[PDB]
Amino acid sequence: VPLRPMTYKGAVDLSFFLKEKGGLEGLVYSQREKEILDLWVYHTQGYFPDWQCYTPGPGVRYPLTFGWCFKLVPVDEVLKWKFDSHLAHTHMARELHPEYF
């Protein structure tokens, strides 16, 4: 498909797709593993890969983009992808760090 920007509408439906149909959930996070993912999504769905960002360490990393419903939790610093459907409702990345926005 053609080329388009991530949108909340889109982000949400995506968050679903991946959860619902396959294993991102609980996947150890990594730089490349992210990146790969980006493109993948892109090739898959023509989203310009500039929307997959999370808040900085320590602890739980919150997706920057409102409506992308995955965060990165620690293991016991090591991060695993986790799905959470409330980040559809709460834009955590925002109260935590309104500076960027």
Residue numbers in the entry: 74 to 149, 179 to 203
Task: Show the paper's wording.
The asymmetric unit contains two protein chains that associate through symmetry to form a tetramer. Surprisingly, the tetramer exhibits 4-fold symmetry as opposed to a normally expected 222 symmetry when two dimers associate together. On the other hand, the N-terminal anchor domain is disordered in the full-length structure. Compared to the dimeric association of the earlier ‘open’ form, one subunit of the core-domain swings out with a relative rotation of about 174° and translation by ∼22 Å with respect to the respective center of masses. Further association with another symmetric pair leads to the formation of the tetramer. This leads to the steric shielding of the PXXP motif in the tetramer. The Arg105 of the earlier Nefcore structure is the first residue of the conserved XR motif, where X is either R or K. In the tetrameric association the Asp125 (Asp123 of Nefcore structure) now interacts with the second R residue of the XR motif. Thus the Nef tetramer can selectively abrogate the recognition of SH3 domains while allowing for interactions with other subsets of its repertoire of protein partners.
HIV-1 Nef is an important accessory protein that is attributed with multiple distinct functions such as immune evasion, virion infectivity and support for viral replication and survival. The C-terminal core-domain functions as the oligomerization and protein interaction domain. It contains the PXXP motif (Residues 72–78) that recognizes SH3 domains of partner proteins and other interaction motifs at a 30-residue loop (Residues 149–178) distal to the PXXP motif.
